[PDB]
From a paper:
As part of our structural genomics effort in targeting novel protein families, we determined crystal structures of three bacterial proteins from a previously structurally uncharacterized protein family Pfam PF08000 [also known as domain of unknown function family 1696 (DUF1696)],11 which appears to be involved in the bacterial cell envelope stress response. These structures share a common domain that is surprisingly similar to the eukaryotic PH-like domains, thus providing the first direct evidence for the existence of PH-like domains in prokaryotes. PHb1 and PHb2 share a common domain that is structurally similar to eukaryotic PH domains, which we have defined as a PHb domain (PH domain in bacteria). The PHb proteins form oligomeric ring assemblies of different sizes and symmetries, providing an excellent example of how molecular architecture can evolve, where the general form of the molecular assembly is preserved, but its size is expandable.
To our surprise, these structures had similarity to eukaryotic PH-like domains that we now define as bacterial PH domain-like proteins from group 1 (PHb1) {S. loihica [PHb1(sl), residues 9–124] and S. amazonensis [PHb1(sa), residues 1–125]} and from group 2 (PHb2) [E. sibiricum 255-15 (PHb2, residues 13–204)]. PHb1(sl) (residues 9–124) has only a single PHb domain that consists of the canonical seven β-strands in two β-sheets (β1–β4 and β5–β7) and a C-terminal helix (α1). It has an additional short β-strand β0 that connects to β1 with a large loop containing helix α0 that packs against the β1–β4 surface. The final model of PHb1(sl) contains 561 amino acid residues, 1 chloride ion, 7 (4S)-2-methyl-2,4-pentanediols, and 322 waters in the asu. PHb1(sl) and PHb1(sa) form a disk with non-crystallographic C5 symmetry that is normally only encountered in viruses with icosahedral capsids. The PHb1(sl) pentamer buries a total surface area of 9080 Å2 (34% of total surface area, 1816 Å2 per monomer). The formation of the pentamer in PHb1(sl) is mediated primarily through hydrogen-bonding interactions. β4 and β5 of two adjacent protomers form an antiparallel β-sheet, consisting of five hydrogen bonds between their main-chain atoms. As a result, the β0–β4 and β5–β7 of the next protomer form an extended eight-stranded β-sheet, arranged like the blades of a propeller (β-blade) at the base of the pentamer. The second contact point in the pentamer involves α1 (residues 113–121) from one monomer and the 310 helix region (residues 25–29) of the adjacent protomer. In PHb1(sl), these residues include Asp42 from β2, Asp55 and Gln57 from β3, and Lys63 from β4, as well as residues from the adjacent protomer: Glu80 from β5 and Asp86, Asp88, and Glu90 from β6.
Residue numbers in the entry:
A (entry chain A): 0, 9 to 124
B (entry chain E): 13 to 56, 61 to 81, 87 to 124
C (entry chain D), D (entry chain B): 12 to 124
E (entry chain C): 10 to 124
C-alpha cells in the first residue's frame, strides 16, 4: 500500500548531474514520500533519507550488470501491489520493492530488461 | 506443446526492445520460457511469478538422473536454482537449449 | 583407457550446443572429464555401485581457481579442487594412480587461462 | 585538478602497467584516491608520521555496486562503500568534509558503469 | 628471506602442467615453497618441509584476483605485505615481502597481468 509519484526528469537531471556519468541519462524516476528510485541507462540510484529532518541520506548505485536475476510476482488482490525482487551480486537476500499504485509496472520491467539483459 | 504465438503476445510488454521469444517448455503447471536474452521461469490463483535469469548470469549447471533434477547456478551467489524435471518433461531439449543459448 | 571421441560425440550429441565440439576426454575410473570447446562436462556414474548419473557442465569462464594436491605416499593418488564462480567450496575429484593427472591439468590450463 | 598528474605519473610509474595511465586523483585529507584507466588506487597513510603506507588497488571491472552516505556530526562528512566481486562486505572509506565527494562519485560513475 | 628462482629451470619442471601459450614471469622460493607469477596465473606451490613428499599446486588465474594491496612498515623500514583477494574466498592471501623480494617488480607484474 501507498502511492508512488513520478518525478520530473528534467529537474532531476539538473540536480543529480554532478554525480552522474558523462554519458548517463535518466530513464525513469519515482518518489515514495522522501525516498527515490531512479532508473538511469547505466544503473539504479536508490536515494533513501532517514531521521526526522531527512538529513541522513544515502545514494546506493546498482549498475544493471550487478543484477544477476530478478522476479516480479503479481498482486493477488486489488488491495495488494506486485512485488519486484532484484538479486544483487554478492548479496544473498534480494532487494524487495513494492510496485506501488502509480508505477508503470510493465515499463519498469521493460526498462530492467532493456538495460540489464 | 506451448503456443508460442500466444505466449509472445502475453510476455510482449515486458520483453526488451531487442528481445524475442524463442522456445518454451511446460514443466508440470509451470513454464520454462527461453528468449534471446534470458530464461523466464513462470510459476503459478491470481498470483504468478516471472523469474528472469539472464543467460550471462548462468555460471554452471547440472542434470542428475526416473526423473531428473536441474541445478542452474547464478553469478554472485552460493545457492543454485533447483528444478525437478519429472517423467514427461523434455529433459534432453531443455539441456540442448541451455547449451545453445548460454554457451 | 583411451576415450573414443567419435562414439562420445554421438552419445553426447543431444545435449551439446549446435556450435559445440568435443576436444578431449579422460576416464577417471567410471567417471569422465569431457572437454568441449565451451565447457568441461564432468560425467559421474556409480555404475554397479548405484543408480545415479550426473552431467555437470562447467563453462571455462566460471572456473575461478584450481588446485592439484598429490599424495606423499606409495598410492601416488592426487586430488583436484575446482573453484567455480559464486561458490567458496571447491568441487573435489579424487584422481587415483592411473589417471592422466598431468594431462587433465594441462588441458584445464589450455582451456581456462 | 587537485594534483600535478605528470608528477604523480612519474611517482607511480614503477607500479603501473605498461599500458596503464593516470586519469584523475583526489586528496582525502592526507590520503589519496588515484583513478587510472584500469583501477582505483587508494593510497592511505597511518600514524602521525604517515610512515605506514598502503596502496590498495580496486580494478573497475571488480566493482559490483557502490554507495555514498552522509556521516559524522550533523551529516557533514560522507562514507563511500565499494562492493567487490566475490565478497559480501564492502570496502568502506570515510570522506571527511573538504574532500571532493561529488567529484569522486562522478568519476566512479564514469569508470565503473 | 626469499630466493629468486631460475625460470629456464622452473619452466622445465612445470612445463607439463603449463598452458601451451603460457610463460613464466617471476618466481620466489622460501624453503621448498614457491610463489610463481606466469603471464596467465599465480601458482602457489606448497611442499611440507624439506622432503615432505606431498605437494600442492594452487593456480590462481589473474582474473580471479578481485583486488590487491601492498602495505609497507615504514619510510626506511622496507618490510611489506602483499594481500591478494581471490574471488569467493573471504580472507586474503597474505604474503610477507622481506629480503630477496623485488616489491616494485611484484607490483609491476600484477598490474601488467591482472589489470
Ligand atoms: Cl576489503
Amino acid at each position: 500500500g501507498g502511492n508512488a509519484a513520478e518525478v520530473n526528469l528534467d529537474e532531476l537531471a539538473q540536480e543529480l548531474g554532478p554525480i552522474m556519468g558523462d554519458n548517463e541519462q535518466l530513464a525513469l524516476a519515482y518518489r515514495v514520500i522522501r525516498d527515490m528510485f531512479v532508473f538511469t541507462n547505466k544503473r539504479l540510484i536508490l536515494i533513501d533519507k532517514q531521521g526526522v529532518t531527512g538529513k541522513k541520506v544515502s545514494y546506493h548505485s546498482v549498475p544493471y550488470k550487478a543484477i544477476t536475476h530478478f522476479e516480479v510476482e503479481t498482486a493477488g488482490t486489488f488491495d495488494m501491489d506486485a512485488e519486484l525482487k532484484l538479486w544483487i551480486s554478492g548479496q544473498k537476500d534480494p532487494l524487495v520493492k513494492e510496485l506501488k499504485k502509480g508505477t508503470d509496472v510493465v515499463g519498469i520491467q521493460k526498462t530492467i530488461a532493456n538495460f540489464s539483459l
